[PDB]
Amino acid sequence: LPPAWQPFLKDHRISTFKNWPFLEGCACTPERMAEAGFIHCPTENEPDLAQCFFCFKELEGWEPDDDPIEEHKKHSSGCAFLSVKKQFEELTLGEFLKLDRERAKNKIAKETNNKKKEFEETAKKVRRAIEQLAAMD
Amino acid sequence: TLPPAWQPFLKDHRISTFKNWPFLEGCACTPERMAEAGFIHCPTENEPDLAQCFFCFKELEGWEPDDDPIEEHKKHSSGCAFLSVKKQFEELTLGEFLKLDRERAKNKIAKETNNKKKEFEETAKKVRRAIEQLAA
Amino acid sequence: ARTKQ
Amino acid sequence: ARTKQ
Ligand SMILES: [Zn+2]
Ligand SMILES: [Zn+2]
C-alpha cells in the first residue's frame, strides 16, 4: 500500500511506537494506542507525544491507566475514526475514499488553525512595537 | 488521489487513455466501451490501434467498428478475473480489491515471463540459422 | 480484433 | 492525558 494510506492500518501504527514507555501491565500499550488511532511522534522535549492520524489531535502527558480510546473521545469527540466499526478490509472503497477525504480536510483545518495562531502572535508583537514608539519612547 | 499504479482500476482513467481513438459515435467499440471492458490505449508507430487489458495484459490489435470490446475480451482472454467482477469499483471491499491487485501482479509476472520466452526462442532461431549457413 | 502478432 | 502547548 502507498505510504500515504499506511496510517490507516493498525500494524503500521503499532510499528511507530519505537521506544514507548508504557508496556504490559498498562492500559495504554502500543497495541491499545494504535487500536485508538494514535501514532508516536516523539521529540527531544515531548518524548511521549502521540497523534491521531485521522483528526491530528496531539496528546502528551500519558499516564499508565489511561484508556487511549476514552482519552481520544474526551479530547477529540469530533473524530470520525471513532465512528468506524468495520475492520480496514471490510470497508468498501467508497467508504474508504470518503474517509480519506475527511482526513485531508482535517489536516488542512489543522494546518490552517496553526497559521492563524502564528499570525495572531506576530500581529501582537508588531502592534506592541508600534504602541511603544507612540509612547514617545 | 490514488497512487498511479492503481489508476488503471478506474474507468475514467482508462477512458482518458484513448487520446486519438478512431472509433467514436456510431461504433460499438467506443472509448467508453473499451474502457468498460478493461482496455487501455497503447498505440505505437506500427500498431496505432493497439489496446491492452490492464488486468490480464492481453494485447489486441485489428479492431473493427462493429466489435463489442467485452465479447472480444471474453473470446481472446477468457481467463481474465476482471471479467468476473460484477460490482462497481467503489462497491468493492478493500479485501476484494487487494485480492484483485495481487492477481494482477501475478498476471504481470506471467506476461513478462511469457515475453522473455519469446525473445529467447527468437534469438535461438537466429543462432541456428547462422550456424546452418556456416556449416554449408 | 486479434492478438498482437 | 493533555493537549500540546
Ligand atoms: Zn482522531
Ligand atoms: Zn483482461
CA distance A34 to A37: 5
Residue A79 in marked binding region = yes
Q: Which of B17, B78, B6, B24 is nearest to B50 (CA)?
A: B17
Distance from CA of C4 to the nearest CA of B (A): 5
Helix axes A93-134, B94-135, angle to 10 degrees: 110
Contacts of B99 in chain A (CB under 8 A): none
The residue of chain B nearest to residue A95, with distances taken between CA atoms, is B90
State this model's resolution in angstroms.
2.7
DSSP classification of residue A60:
E
Looking at all shown ligands, the one closest to residue B111's CA atom is 2
DSSP classification of residue A25:
T
Q: Looking at chain A, which subunits does it touch, using at least 3 CB pairs closer than 8 Å as the criterion?
A: B, D
The single-letter code of the amino acid at A19 is N
- The separation between CA B59 and the C-alpha centre of its own chain, rounded to angstroms, equals 5
The residue of chain C nearest to residue B68, with distances taken between CA atoms, is C1
E strand or H helix that includes residue A58:
strand A58-60
Residue in this structure with the C-alpha cell 467503489, named with its chain if needed = B90
CA distance B52 to C4: 10
CA distance A18 to B20: 53
Q: Are B80 and B56 in contact (CB under 8 A)?
A: yes
Distance from CA of B91 to the nearest CA of A (A): 6
Q: Where are the beta strands (DSSP E) in B3-95?
A: 39-41, 51-53, 59-61
The Cα-based distances of B56 to B5, B39, B42, B89 in angstroms read: 15, 10, 15, 17
Return contacts of B73-82, CB within 8 angstroms, 24+ apart: B73/B37, B73/B38, B73/B39, B76/C1, B76/C2, B76/C3, B77/B53, B80/B38, B80/B53, B80/B55, B80/B56, B81/B55, B81/B56, B82/B38, B82/B53, B82/B54, B82/B55, B82/B56
Mutate to test the interface with D, among A26, A38, A41, A58 (most CBs of D within 10 A): A58
CA distance A93 to A86: 13
- The separation between CA B105 and the C-alpha centre of its own chain, rounded to angstroms, equals 13
CA distance A58 to A39: 10
Q: Which of B44, B24, B26, B46 is nearest to B34 (CA)?
A: B24
The Cα-based distances of A53 to A34, A59, B59 in angstroms read: 10, 12, 42
Q: Which of A4, A61, A14 is nearest to A38 (CA)?
A: A14
Contacts of B47 (CB under 8 A, 6+ apart): B61, C4
C-alpha cell at B24: 467514436
CA distance A75 to A64: 17
Contact flag for A and D (3+ C-beta pairs < 8 Å):
yes
Q: Are A4 and B5 in contact (CB under 8 A)?
A: no
Dihedral sign, CA of A80, A86, A88, A91? Answer: negative
Q: Which of B97, B96, B34, B19 is nearest to B65 (CA)?
A: B34
Contacts of C5 in chain B (CB under 8 A): 61
Contacts of B64 (CB under 8 A, 6+ apart): B29, C1
Q: Are A46 and A14 in contact (CB under 8 A)?
A: no
Q: Are B47 and C2 in contact (CB under 8 A)?
A: no
Q: In 10 A of CB B85, how many CB atoms?
A: 16
CA distance B77 to B59: 10
CA distance A99 to A4: 13
Contact: D4, A58; criterion CB under 8 Å: yes
Q: How far is the CA of B77 from the centre of ligand 2 (A)?
A: 6
Looking at all shown ligands, the one closest to residue A55's CA atom is 1
C-alpha cell at A120: 495572531
Q: How was this structure determined?
A: X-ray
The Cα-based distances of A112 to A7, A78, B44 in angstroms read: 22, 17, 47
Q: Are B83 and B73 in contact (CB under 8 A)?
A: yes
Strand A38-40 vs strand D2-3: parallel, antiparallel, or unpaired? unpaired
Contacts of B50 in chain C (CB under 8 A): 4
